[PDB]
Symmetry: C2
């Protein structure tokens, strides 16, 4: 069949990338038993996570470029196999430089995992159904992060942490061979109807304007997601429960934002003057700017908890959503032989925006104020969003001048 192989491959990629993000954060999930068995300094823990972050930052770009030419099935399954073998080796090992070297190799394979899912979603799902299944496969990450600490607590209650990571690695080995058996790269590999130069991709201005948009939106995400609790504790007198519930409501709004961004974007593609995935994208960046303004101005010590959770969920709907849409458009606006390169350049701008939003935002927050820092992030977001509204208005004027 056609939809049969579609749902078999999507369930295989769902389970595979679920075990990917389960092993992207397994050390963070198993941290209490590991620090109970052997003492590790917090600088060592931050270094192990930072080595994974640097390896995953490199391996996003390297995996996109290498997933352009190589087959997506073997590359996905080989990465998940390396993930499993790394977690087995992590269960065998008992020291911090070997923990960091193995977790660096895990960061490499975690980067190796996703651009095959992007290539297979592009080959199997038409653009009327590409965004919503992109969104479901990207909230496989959210399901893995939700069932991570729960299964970590269950396996720490029942088993040791050694056997927990050994069973996680063995499960990722078995599911890597199952994703090698189940996933197919294109419908031409079975017998179904299968549905430019790299300099032309790099010299295309739409890739770079999408790149700067993803820079701004992921920087705003990283700013608020890393410093919203600090903005509510230190300046506006909110409790730690309010900041923690703000982050939880922002993540719930982000789940809803990814899913609704994919579905409403595919509804916009189906009902259709430019890319139809922009009418949700720019309206939702404008909603992100409105949520930042309402969160910076109207939140006070006397603000109701319901209103600050509403602003958290509205920002989560409006920041995770445009990032999911930038992933969809970056995989989609490129040619099929260069789509991993486009999504890889977008992930490179994720790394640039994460750097620009982590530490310089803390410096603007330390020297001026927290409100002045989020005002700077709001000025960047509002200026960029108004610039994109001017760009789509200018493109509509150009397309009117064509006809």
């Amino acid at each position: 069949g056609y939809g049969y192989y579609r749902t078999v491959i999507f369930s295989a990629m769902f389970g595979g990338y679920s075990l990917y993000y389960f092993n992207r954060k397994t050390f963070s999930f198993v941290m209490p038993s590991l620090v109970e068995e052997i003492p590790l300094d917090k600088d060592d823990l931050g270094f192990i996570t930072s080595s994974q972050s640097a390896a995953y930052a490199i391996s996003k770009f390297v995996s996109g470029v290498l997933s352009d030419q190589m087959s997506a099935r073997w590359l996905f399954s080989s990465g998940l196999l390396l993930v499993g073998l790394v977690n087995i080796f992590f269960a065998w090992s008992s020291t911090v430089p070997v923990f960091a070297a193995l977790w660096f190799l895990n960061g490499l394979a975690q980067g190796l995992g996703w651009p095959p899912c992007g290539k297979v979603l592009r080959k199997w799902f038409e653009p009327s159904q590409f965004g919503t299944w992109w969104a479901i496969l990207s909230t496989s990450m959210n399901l893995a992060g939700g069932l991570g600490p729960i299964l970590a607590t269950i396996l720490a209650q029942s088993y040791s942490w050694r056997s927990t990571l050994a069973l996680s690695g063995a499960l990722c080995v078995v599911v890597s061979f199952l994703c090698l058996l189940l996933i197919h790269n294109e419908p031409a590999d079975v017998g179904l109807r299968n549905l430019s130069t790299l300099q032309e991709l790099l010299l295309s201005p739409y890739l770079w304007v999408l790149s700067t948009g993803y820079l701004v939106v992921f920087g705003v995400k990283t700013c608020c997601t890393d410093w919203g609790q600090f903005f509510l504790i230190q300046e506006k007198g909110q409790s730690a429960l309010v900041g923690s519930s703000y982050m939880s409501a922002l993540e719930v709004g982000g789940l809803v934002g990814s899913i609704a961004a994919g579905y409403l974007s595919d509804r916009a593609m189906a009902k259709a003057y430019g890319n139809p995935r922009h009418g949700l994208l720019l309206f939702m960046m404008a909603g992100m700017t409105v949520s930042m303004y309402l969160f910076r101005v109207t939140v006070t010590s006397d603000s109701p908890k319901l209103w600050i959770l509403v602003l958290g969920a509205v920002f989560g709907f409006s920041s995770y959503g445009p990032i999911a849409l930038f992933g969809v458009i970056a995989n989609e606006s490129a040619p099929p032989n260069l789509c991993g390169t486009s999504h890889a350049i977008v992930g490179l701008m994720a790394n640039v925006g994460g750097f620009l939003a982590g530490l310089p935002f803390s410096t603007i927050a330390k020297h001026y104020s927290w409100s002045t820092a989020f005002w700077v992030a709001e000025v960047i977001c509002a200026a960029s969003t108004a610039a994109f509204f001017l760009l789509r208005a200018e493109e509509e004027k150009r397309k009117a001048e064509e006809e």
Copy 2:
């Protein structure tokens, strides 16, 4: 004439890149007057230098790729003009986030400076004279770092620090217009005899084996240059004078290593079975491995100061030298329309090796020992160097099998 325009353009690039590295480190040179006028935390100083380091890391690659297509004269002079305008704006400004934003823009333009010098040295100097003038133009950086604190002390004694950076920025503006007037891109732009795809460059294995060699050599450089004083204070009982004089002798040996690497490499190109710039390169990586072995084993608390300065100078001759040769070969083994891309990928591996050698080497040093950490770096260096000797022996066997 021909040699007349050659020496005019080389003196112009010498003065220009000298003012580049003078303004890459002017904040580090003017630090005492700046912290006397306004108090800055050491985290803020490390953040300003780290923002320059990240911007320079990005701008190496971006400037190589953009110096492939764009003209080298305008790009060099525009970068030096942005350097001057940034230092003037830095003299006008009086706060830490604006210091960091301007110094980020300075890191961008400092990255923008050098790949035009690489392109112009490739267009004007033949390969029998390319390496030695590469070496002299790269020790313009050493001359700038040597005359940096001296002129900083003189201008802090005579003038303020505001007017010091204002005169530095004004001098870089004037010298940017002079480097726009004096430098020429190619000999065809005057009337003299002027002497492949990017996928073919990326898929070439020689670029990637040169890439991994530069990874190893710059990692070994960064390891010993950042942790030799720590290896001599904490483990081997040497004084702080011995560690400081070790770093000074390693930098003097590095000056000699860059100059002698360029000159002996061009002598090897002139006397000539493979690239003739390898017989010095691999012998000198082997000398780097021998210097690391003799520094790890034979240095003790009872070691003479002359012997440890000899090992510092022998490592400096043998680590800065292969990095200068990797720069020469990366600019040279690529086609002239893609040479900045090759040197940009090599600078990307400078960033990867700097990350891999800064903090994980500190972790191996903290958990095992300092001697075990430099033993790990020595194992990486010796394994890589023996692998390159096996590669050139295998290539000589292949070229014997051809004829």
